[PDB]
């Protein structure tokens with residue numbers, strides 16, 4: 232839960248690459264998620280009709296929702312762990328309305344790492360992957376604790 236200053240630097244350095252194309256990264260990540268863990272698609276009434284990766288690729292709505300997710304995640308990561316204010320609304324909606332278990336947040340964490348690895352091999356080597364894994368794990372653990380604080384079992 233305590234990353235080194237160097238680890239946060241590696242996280243924010245590759246995050247800057249994501250920010251050059253937020254929608255493309257977001258669509259790639261959601262498509263990877265739905266492909267790797269298809270049960271997650273069923274949480275989205277707006278996407279559950281999409282039956283193939285190619286259909287997902289053509290979905291402009293999926294690109295927009297990719298921006299929605301990554302915009303929130305980027306703001307969290309930039310806080311370098313001090314993200315209490317940012318997790319409050321996300322925990323509220325994801326625990327009590329969307330009903331997303333923490334395990335699904337683990338699935339999307341794996342998708343994020345997969346997409347970063349594929350799109351940024353030169354800036355996402357072993358050290359950067361380790362750092363991003365720690366940053367996403369911190370996010371998951373803190374949001375799991377916030378679910379519990381709100382009265383819910385993630």
Ligand code: HEM
Nearest residue numbers: 271274275277299300303304320321324329331335336339
């Ligand atoms: C990095 C992890 C995630 C982030 C930052 C994130 C962020 C967001 C944001 C900002 C919204 C819109 C505002 C809100 O309702 O809170 C949203 C909506 C939503 N999220 Fe997430 N989300 C994440 C992971 C997930 C996962 C893994 C699932 C399901 C597998 C999910 C399911 C949903 C659903 C169903 C909605 C509403 C969709 C709709 O209205 O059509 N989220 N998310």
